[PDB]
């Protein structure tokens, strides 16, 4: 559930990069034992990568359960991450990316061999994940398939995807918790009954994510905004990239780092006093 800093080179060029729970939970481990089983037998390695993609879709249903949109959206992230794992771009520490490099006949810090392997399997890896989705929900709907298109995340910088995911998940939870804060109190001018419990939860949440964002935005500004993120600002870029569910970052936190007061980010002026009593 937490956004850990278990990333590669986090003291160096990856300072402030946070690792998504979804990615931490993406099981894809190669042991140094099976380094030869996969090298001499190219299609055995394939069946393992395909089934790792399979199991990932099976894991996602266990988490989100009957939330079709919430599972499909994560598939596209996990799919892309497998690409990063394969290509060597991945940022997690014990990702066994070193072992994959040797298996695909590249090794010693190269890219060409393992880059072409991904390029040749992207389609079939995704096709597996589609069969995994079908095994999870029964029948693939005739109008559901538009969501389940072959996704374009593979070439996009990983941190940018990870940050986008953070922001989406942040805005979804922030909105969810701000909704419970209204269905707990409408007027309570002052101590009343249950309202403050939600106020503590919303405030706590904003303050957990405050630190996380400060860490993620530290990396963004240093590297990715400077070269090519369309030179847009941190909250400004996600405002036009991932639809309207990353706008809450700009809509409530752009003008100033007003994270310092979590109650100031409330559009309704009525409920603001019950939490700030």
Residue numbers in the entry: 2350 to 2539, 2547 to 2633
Give the authors' words.
PfEMP1s are adhesive proteins containing multiple discrete extracellular domains, falling mostly into two families, the cysteine-rich interdomain region and the Duffy binding-like (DBL) domains. While several DBL domains from different PfEMP1 proteins bind to CSA, VAR2CSA is the primary CSA receptor in placental malaria. The binding of VAR2CSA on the surface of infected erythrocytes to CSPG in the placenta plays a major part in malaria during pregnancy, and an understanding of this interaction will be valuable in the development of therapeutics to target this form of the disease. In this study, we present the structure of the DBL6ɛ domain of VAR2CSA and characterisation of the CSPG-binding sites of the DBL3X and DBL6ɛ domains.
Using a bacterial expression system, we expressed the DBL6ɛ domain of VAR2CSA (residues 2333–2634) from the 3D7 strain of Plasmodium falciparum. We expressed both the DBL6ɛ domain and the C2480S mutant and were able to crystallise C2480S. The structure was determined using multiple-wavelength dispersion data from a selenomethionine derivative and was refined to 3.0 Å resolution. DBL6ɛ shares a similar basic fold with other DBL domains containing a “boomerang”-shaped α-helical core that aligns to the core of the DBL3X structure with a root-mean-square deviation of 1.6 Å. DBL6ɛ is shorter (302 residues compared with 359 for DBL3X) due to more compact loop structures and a shorter subdomain 1. DBL6ɛ also contains fewer disulfide bonds than other DBL domain structures, lacking three of the bonds that stabilise the first two subdomains of DBL3X. While all other current DBL domain structures contain a disulfide bond linking the second helix of subdomain 2 to the linker that connects subdomains 2 and 3, this is not present in DBL6ɛ, showing that this bond is not essential for the DBL domain fold. Indeed, the features proposed to form the CSPG-binding site of DBL3X, the sulfate-binding loop and the positively charged surface, are absent in DBL6ɛ, agreeing with a recent prediction based on molecular modeling. However, no clear additional density due to ligand could be observed after structure determination.
